[PDB]
Scaffold this active site. Structure first.
Site, PDB file in Angstrom:
ATOM      1  N   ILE A 295       1.367  -0.171  -1.254  1.00 33.17           N
ATOM      2  CA  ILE A 295       0.670   0.831  -1.043  1.00 33.17           C
ATOM      3  C   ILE A 295      -0.001   1.664  -2.253  1.00 33.17           C
ATOM      4  O   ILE A 295       0.816   2.629  -2.697  1.00 33.17           O
ATOM      5  CB  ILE A 295       0.926   1.668   0.170  1.00 33.17           C
ATOM      6  CG1 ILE A 295       1.690   0.740   1.089  1.00 33.17           C
ATOM      7  CG2 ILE A 295      -0.044   2.740   0.504  1.00 33.17           C
ATOM      8  CD1 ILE A 295       0.715  -0.133   1.649  1.00 33.17           C
TER       9      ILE A 295
ATOM     10  N   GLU B 127      -7.052  -6.401  -2.809  1.00 28.12           N
ATOM     11  CA  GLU B 127      -8.162  -6.324  -1.995  1.00 28.12           C
ATOM     12  C   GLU B 127      -8.629  -7.648  -1.733  1.00 28.12           C
ATOM     13  O   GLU B 127      -9.778  -7.894  -1.671  1.00 28.12           O
ATOM     14  CB  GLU B 127      -9.263  -5.680  -3.025  1.00 28.12           C
ATOM     15  CG  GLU B 127     -10.185  -5.072  -2.057  1.00 28.12           C
ATOM     16  CD  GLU B 127      -9.866  -3.830  -1.458  1.00 28.12           C
ATOM     17  OE1 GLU B 127      -8.642  -3.496  -1.594  1.00 28.12           O
ATOM     18  OE2 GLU B 127     -10.525  -3.016  -0.580  1.00 28.12           O
TER      19      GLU B 127
END
Lengths: 371, 370
Positions: B150, B356
């Site tokens: 994260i 991503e």
């Protein structure tokens, strides 16, 4: 009868001995030595006792006197355990020990080669400059003033072959070689460079100020320095080629293992086609580069011309290794970018294989000249 | 003003992003890499110039840029500092946008002003080692679980957390929560040691008895999956743009090195191999850029563009590794040294093929749409 073009049992035994040592004694500390930029002096001492620092030296000087193919196999194994360690050994063997062996007087060999062949004294090679380094004859000593850059083991080595101009009017015919203990007064490490990888091996800028070297430490005749500097291009390039194969292999094995453990969860890797085909390509590229490296080593062992082939091997293996190491990172997904897995370090370690020992374009230049 | 060329406003934003990145991000990039130092001060300066509110409306303190301008700005930020561009890309596309699109008026009032001006950095916590769950307890939800990889999980201020609220409903059973990172029960389990982008914290998170007001649930129960995927395109466009920016910085470094240390001021075309390699690098950068801007144009127009965004991300990320490596090679021995920027940019850019959506995730999205 021994099968033509296959490794002998002795070559396979040497490979296994190098593998056993590299996996048991080098691999467990490799990550730590990367983090600490720590020279592997303790491990080199171990290796030296087992003959791995004397592979290119004859037995009468304390070496193990390996054939060039066995030497390449050993370097590959060492590199698969710890890349920087394989650099230190390749340099030590090919341009530290060999120049003294070939060009040394009997007394120079007596003074230097036994401690180098057992790895007590680590050898380095100081040619490249930011030649402006010169050596002035002063009675029974030469006085050396100058500087060098990108010198492997310039700080942690014990003996360095220094190249200096003795006749500025003779150009490439006016260079001489000198055996220089690194604790000679006037020998100075100006810097140890912070690198992308191979942190454990010191790459140094050197300075020499009023550095007195006994005339008995001149390697070869005055003027022989250029010949000496080029005397081991093939051995050095074969060694770096082998280390690139070894690092690529280590990254491939890591990726193969990660695929089996974390992608297919024990099932045949072939069940994940893209990853299986990527690993197949990696394996193919590694094996193909290896055969080029061993071919060049075989030619060198037979004393045949092999500058072209050694350069080819160094070129193709160094470039291969970056591609395979990068694919190894990709197979790990997010974990590939993490220091917790070894492939990011191996990637960093291997990138310089295209740069030192002749940049890729330097390799292409000599290959082009020999077409 | 030709309709396929940048508008003057877009060029002005590019130049403003460039001036800030070159003056205030590039000089400190090497140090933040060495020190693994979050660019809090620089983000604050950026925020005051509007660069942390590019996807937010002006009424919330944003600068409300069109997607092309956003992409241009991210390329510039990345050419200054790769890690910083990641922080901004994440903050803008998956930090601010979910709150903008799905938030109540009160939630937007409480969170968007400080996020748009960059005082509060946003993060997005979906990925797991979903097992994270949220149970209703009066006027709070109680969240328990863990998250992996994260961005800004430690240094950020507000993270969108995804948790299961109905285990029997599968992908319809997820909800989203706006979670201040100083909520009791919110724990950074680890800040990962990475190959590069050291300045940006990538974190493992743990949630233990983490009580979150009902008023912080973003959208209705079960709306979490939709919210999680709501910014795939804008996220991938941004990461594509940062790969172009890092590649460009490495190219410029190699071009300058060639001029100063190879040709010694003489025209680069007098050294054919290096000239041709630099030509190829410049070409690959420009080609990737036009794909990024095309994906951005489609997004701005509200046209389907998941394929084009995925293409842009795939193409730019792979291009950037190749160009950054070429940049190292042109530097010779110096290319492997930390005293020159190209080894850092090389480390920084490698993850662009991984987060991503991995390259193979991009290929799957592209394939299924053919």
């Amino acid at each position: 009868h021994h099968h033509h073009m296959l490794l002998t049992d002795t070559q396979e035994q040497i490979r296994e001995a190098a593998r056993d040592f590299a996996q048991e004694r080098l691999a467990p500390g490799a990550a730590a030595r990367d983090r600490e930029h720590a020279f592997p002096r303790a491990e080199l001492t171990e290796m030296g006792a087992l003959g791995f620092l004397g592979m290119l030296a004859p037995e009468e000087w304390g070496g193990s006197d390996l054939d060039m193919v066995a030497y390449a196999l050993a370097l590959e194994e060492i590199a698969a355990g710890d890349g920087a360690c394989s650099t230190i050994v390749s340099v030590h063997s090919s341009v530290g020990c060999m120049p003294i062996l070939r060009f040394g007087t009997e007394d120079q060999k007596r003074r230097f080669l036994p401690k180098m062949a057992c790895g007590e004294w680590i050898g380095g090679f100081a040619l490249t400059e930011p030649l402006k380094t010169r050596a002035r004859l002063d009675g029974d000593h030469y006085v050396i003033d100058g500087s060098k850059q990108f010198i492997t083991s310039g700080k942690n080595g014990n003996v360095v072959i220094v190249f200096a101009v003795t006749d500025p009017a003779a150009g490439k015919k006016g260079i001489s070689a000198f055996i220089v203990p690194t604790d000679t007064p006037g020998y100075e490490v100006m810097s140890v460079e912070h690198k992308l990888g191979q942190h454990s091996s010191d790459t140094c800028a050197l300075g020499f100020t009023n550095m007195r070297v006994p005339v008995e430490n001149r390697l070869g005749a005055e003027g022989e320095g250029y010949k000496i500097a080029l005397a081991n291009l093939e051995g050095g390039r074969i060694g770096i080629a082998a280390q690139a194969v070894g690092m690529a292999r280590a990254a491939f094995e890591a990726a193969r293992d990660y695929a089996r453990e974390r992608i297919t969860f024990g099932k045949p890797i072939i069940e994940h086609q893209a990853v299986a085909f990527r690993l197949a390509d990696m394996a193919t590229r590694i094996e193909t580069a290896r055969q080029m490296v061993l071919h060049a080593a075989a030619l060198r062992e037979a004393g045949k011309p092999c500058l072209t082939e050694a350069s080819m091997a160094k070129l193709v293996a160094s470039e291969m290794a970056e591609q395979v190491c990068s694919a190894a990172i990709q197979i790990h997904g997010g974990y590939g970018y993490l220091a917790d897995y070894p492939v990011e370090r191996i990637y960093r370690d291997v990138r310089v294989c295209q740069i030192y020992e002749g940049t890729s374009d330097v390799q292409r230049l000599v290959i082009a000249r020999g077409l």
